[PDB]
Design a protein around this ligand. Structure first.
Ligand SMILES: [Ca+2]
Ligand SMILES: [Zn+2]
Length: 392
């Protein structure tokens, strides 16, 4: 039963778009419907964030903050200078000005959005020492995000998040395959990749890098430029953060806040082979991942990198072992759900038999009751005690 009235905020991964994009086909619901609308209809106030799908977690966090409380995106002077991109980005009206007045939110994140959510909490709570110092030494202005002391976030829920990275990035042809994946999702939305749509359709939001699809350019063409751009070749990217080494680095500073509840959901859509020990995609797996991605993930080992048999089970895009919470380079604690949701630790909700895209409804799965999944989750979030009392 309801203990809090915090609104829910939905957040996407390396693919994602606003409610008005993709001609209305939702990331959060896809072919199954509109998850936000369902929650809202059931009495759970819910909103959706849209940030750069290919941008670093940092960039996304800055975008999220500003999208939340309003204003112009501020990536941090130190950060901007270090990576060679703009300091300021786009301007937002603010979905929830209530945040600057004591309110709190629950964040439900998918895929890489889980890393973003964590980072946001971290920055909100602790700010950035580096940014503070840079401001002081150079006399530049400083975003409140980097000051610390903000407590918006009551909880963070992650679904199919590569907390420890994903070995998908180790594919020799990762670059091409990754963009083919973006092409696949466009396909799911009935959007062609070889057509120069004059309407935006899918805004990658690369204002900091000064990149945008030009007139006369199709997605295929656009992706070819992107592949050669700083959003693909620099360390300040989703590409990097998505890697095992990158996730590890992020984990070294992005810690669980003791004042926030964390829930983790893992996904899998594979079966083990008895002779090989490898994992193979199940029947029903989205066509975007079944042919090349899943098999790679289910067979890729790397001793020096620390990738062993535990990493093989996957949901087609991410290794299931990476989803229960940050482990590599992390001090965070992870406890298996036992009926009690604990604060300031990762409550491992278990593993669900659904693939990376099925879980958000981008790919169909009649056996998966998506509406009930999200409503059950929402119910659980609403039951969280903003202050738990200590007892026997
Ligand atoms: Ca399916
Ligand atoms: Zn950046």
């Amino acid at each position: 039963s309801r203990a809090n009235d915090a609104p829910i905020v939905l957040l996407h991964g390396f693919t994602g778009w606003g409610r008005e994009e993709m001609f209305g086909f939702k990331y959060w619901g896809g072919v199954r419907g509109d998850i936000e609308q369902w929650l809202n209809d059931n009495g759970y106030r819910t909103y959706t964030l849209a940030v750069g799908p290919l941008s670093s977690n940092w960039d996304r966090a800055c975008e999220a903050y500003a999208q939340l409380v309003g204003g112009t995106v501020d990536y941090g002077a130190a950060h901007a200078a270090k990576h060679g991109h703009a300091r300021f980005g786009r301007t937002y009206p603010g979905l929830l000005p209530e945040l600057k007045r004591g309110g709190r939110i629950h964040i439900i994140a998918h895929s890489q959005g889980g890393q973003t959510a964590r980072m946001l909490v971290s920055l909100l709570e602790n700010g950035s020492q580096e940014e503070r110092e840079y401001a002081k030494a150079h006399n530049v202005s400083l975003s409140p995000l980097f000051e610390g002391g903000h407590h918006f976030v009551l909880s963070v829920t992650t679904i199919a998040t590569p907390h420890d990275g994903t070995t998908l990035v180790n594919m020799v042809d990762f670059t091409d395959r990754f963009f083919d994946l973006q092409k696949c999702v466009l396909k799911a939305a009935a959007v062609a990749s070889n057509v120069p749509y004059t309407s935006q359709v899918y805004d990658f939001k690369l204002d900091q890098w000064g990149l945008r699809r030009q007139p006369g350019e199709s997605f295929d063409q656009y992706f070819e430029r992107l592949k050669r751009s700083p959003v693909w070749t620099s360390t300040d990217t989703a590409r990097y953060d998505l890697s095992v080494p990158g996730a590890e680095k992020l984990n070294q500073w992005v810690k669980a806040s003791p004042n926030t509840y964390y829930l983790s959901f893992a996904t899998e859509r594979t079966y083990r082979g008895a002779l090989t020990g490898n994992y193979y995609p199940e029947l029903g797996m989205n066509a975007c991942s079944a042919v090349v991605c899943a098999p790679f993930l289910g067979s890729y080992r790397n001793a020096t990198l620390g990738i062993d048999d535990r990493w093989l089970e996957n949901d087609g895009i991410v290794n299931a072992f990476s989803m229960n919470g940050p482990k590599r380079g992390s001090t965070d604690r992870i406890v298996p759900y036992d009926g009690t949701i604990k604060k300031g630790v990762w409550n491992d909700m278990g593993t669900y038999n659904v693939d990376h895209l099925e879980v958000i409804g981008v790919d169909p799965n009649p056996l998966f009751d998506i509406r009930a999944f999200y409503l059950r989750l929402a119910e659980q979030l609403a039951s969280l005690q903003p202050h738990h009392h200590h007892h026997h």
